[PDB]
Amino acid sequence: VLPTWSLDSNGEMRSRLSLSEVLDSGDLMKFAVDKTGCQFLEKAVKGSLTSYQKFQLFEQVIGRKDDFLKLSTNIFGNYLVQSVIGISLATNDDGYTKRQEKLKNFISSQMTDMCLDKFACRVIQSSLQNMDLSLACKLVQALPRDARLIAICVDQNANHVIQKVVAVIPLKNWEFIVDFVATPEHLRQICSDKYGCRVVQTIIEKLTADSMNVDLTSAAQNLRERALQRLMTSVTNRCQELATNEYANYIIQHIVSNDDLAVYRECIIEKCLMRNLLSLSQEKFASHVVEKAFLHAPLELLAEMMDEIFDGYIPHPDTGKDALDIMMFHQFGNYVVQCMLTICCDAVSGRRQTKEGGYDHAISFQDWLKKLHSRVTKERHRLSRFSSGKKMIETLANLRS
RNA sequence: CAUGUGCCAU
């Protein structure tokens, strides 16, 4: 595959082969897509480069559209393109603006195809990270705004381009991605997907006013807050679909677990989880969300949650004597009951705070623990047959000390 | 029932 003027009598490259010989020969494309040839170029381009060698490298690697696209989508050549891009941005000569402008053009024209390509998406992320801000923002504007943007968010490779944008580009230049994701149909498709949920999760974290965003100005905080409220509105409106989904349940858990998103935790608990705890506790994926709600709900909402379990309506009653008995022995609900019991034991033993709003809720935790202990005592025979039941009994048996 | 799900990609 390599041109014969570069091989040995054994079929390998000559030791005294130089970078200028490859650049002057016009056969760089044959080396860059070859295994051992690309690695020669990888070592060569990181040595000392004369003015003309940079001239030749820039032209042949990032100066021709078809050659640039062909190398960016190659299993080996994509590494060479990333190396030359880095050299081009560290070489502040005359054509520093021409080369970066041309590089923008080559990428913008084939933005969707290279995002979806396993190897060219690496060129996108490297360019977003190292290009000047004003140039990197032009690549962001080149992202599609239709159904192709959904395919990017759910692609195994293209989703990292969106994650890179979120990480290194200011929110002002990718706010349209937030409002695209917050569109209900797009949110449904994206949050039902393995890679799409990580994209939405990364967006939520960046839009959170936590310790990592304290460096923002007031204008950047206001912009971030408005984008957060819009996205949270769509998330909370589809909370039932998301909490029960195999992938989106991690997003609802993150929101409920994050103190810096407390307003949306309480919104999720009321609009979605309340009056549905019994049904959701028997769900494979939503039961994890119910555990998080019990762990992190404010004490006023927690009291309503406890009261819903202890004296809750069972519409269309069949099996189980009450909601507590159903959950106590259900294959998934038993983890919720263990969570309820551990919360109450931690509160009674001074391991969990019982004061909120200035008033102590210890008397309520005492009442909930008394109900659970009374139930576990009367059910001890059947609980002894289950792993969960053994742990519930031991939890109450260890609180005696 | 000694029990119940991910992303982390050349």
Residue numbers in the entry: 167 to 567
Paper text:
A candidate emerged just three nucleotides downstream of FBEa. Its sequence (5′-CAUGUUGCCAUU-3′) contained key FBE features (boldface): a 5′ UGU, 3′ AU, and an upstream C, and these features are conserved among Caenorhabditids. The candidate sequence deviated from a canonical FBE: a uridine followed the UGU, rather than typical purine, and a second uridine replaced the typical final adenosine. We first determined a 2.2 Å resolution crystal structure of the FBF-2 RBD in complex with an 11-nt RNA carrying FBEa*. Indeed, FBF-2 bound to FBEa* by recognizing the 5′ and 3′ nucleotides common to FBEa and FBEa*: FBF-2 interacts with 5′-CAUGU and CCAU-3′ in both FBEa and FBEa*. The FBF-2 RBD structure changes little (RMSD = 0.37 Å over 2, 744 atoms). The RNA sequences align in the 5′ and 3′ regions, and the side chains that contact the RNA bases in each structure are equivalent and positioned similarly. No electron density was seen for the atypical U4 base of FBEa* (cyan arrow), so U4 is likely flipped away from the RNA-binding surface, as seen with other PUF binding elements with flipped bases. Following the flipped U4 nucleotide, PUF repeat 5 (R5) interacted with G5 of FBEa* in a manner similar to its interaction with G4 of FBEa. We next measured FBF-2 binding affinities to a 14-nt RNA carrying FBEa* using an electrophoretic mobility shift assay (EMSA). Despite equivalent contacts with the two RNAs, FBF-2 RBD bound to FBEa* RNA with a KD = 427 nM, ~6-fold weaker than its previously reported binding to FBEa RNA (KD = 70 nM).
